[PDB]
Amino acid sequence: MALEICVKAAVGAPNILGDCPFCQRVLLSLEEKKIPYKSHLINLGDKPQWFLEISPEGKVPVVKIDDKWVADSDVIVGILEEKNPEPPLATPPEFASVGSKIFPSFVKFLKSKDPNDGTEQALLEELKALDGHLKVHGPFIAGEKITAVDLSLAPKLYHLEVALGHFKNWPIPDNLTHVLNYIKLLFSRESFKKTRAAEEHVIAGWEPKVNA
Numbered sequence: 001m002a003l004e005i006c007v008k009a010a011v012g013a014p015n016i017l018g019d020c021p022f023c024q025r026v027l028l029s030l031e032e033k034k035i036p037y038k039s040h041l042i043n044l045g046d047k048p049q050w051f052l053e054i055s056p057e058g059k060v061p062v063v064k065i066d067d068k069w070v071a072d073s074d075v076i077v078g079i080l081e082e083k084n085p086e087p088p089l090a091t092p093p094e095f096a097s098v099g100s101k102i103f104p105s106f107v108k109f110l111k112s113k114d115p116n117d118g119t120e121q122a123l124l125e126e127l128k129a130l131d132g133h134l135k136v137h138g139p140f141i142a143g144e145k146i147t148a149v150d151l152s153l154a155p156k157l158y159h160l161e162v163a164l165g166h167f168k169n170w171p172i173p174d175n176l177t178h179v180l181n182y183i184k185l186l187f188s189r190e191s192f193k194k195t196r197a198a199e200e201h202v203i204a205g206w207e208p209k210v211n212a
């Protein structure tokens with residue numbers, strides 16, 4: 001019965017969330033559904049021994065759906081948006097084609113040993129290719145409503161705004177007229193606003209993950 005979820009505790013502050021935007025996806029779909037769940041803050045620097053019985057890689061996120069474990073957040077989202085008591089949302093439209101390039105390229109932006117100044121010249125055209133069709137639909141990165149492309153990207157855009165803001169506060173121009181207003185929606189709803197990490201505890205989670 002029920003839903004139990006294991007998620008990133010902050011570095012040094014085990015009672016709050018820190019850097020794992022992949023955990024923030026799982027909170028986002030549960031809070032869009034408003035469905036009852038139970039959350040377990042895992043310290044990744046000192047992992048509970050029983051946590052390997054839930055996640056064989058020792059990673060977060062991992063969940064229990066009806067007490068049965070599921071790891072990796074794109075698989076966890078795939079099962080939650082297909083096999084749950086609230087309506088299923090596992091429908092990827094055309095926005096998943098560009099969004100699946102943005103998905104790793106915005107993690108590589110936060111790991112830009114390979115220059116971000118050269119990478120950004122592709123990211124502006126990735127954002128234009130998404131935004132040019134999203135401005136026909138209006139509100140969300142999957143179109144008229146939240147589906148898999150918001151669940152793939154929404155916490156990663158807020159994580160870029162915070163963690164890239166610490167050294168290269170990269171502006172979204174008003175020509176990206178969906179993207180620049182969609183970032184303001186991350187401070188709203190149950191689905192985005194409840195999932196917002198403490199912003200120092202994103203930055204102090206992300207620094208060693210420029211390397212690791």
Ligand SMILES: *SC[C@H](NC(=O)CC[C@H](N)C(=O)O)C(=O)NCC(=O)O
Pocket residue numbers: 019020021022023044045058059060061071072073074
């Ligand atoms: S976010 C911190 C690490 N998790 C992941 O990177 C999850 C990637 C998956 N494909 C996903 O769920 O989407 C993590 O748990 N690191 C362990 C550590 O010891 O820090």
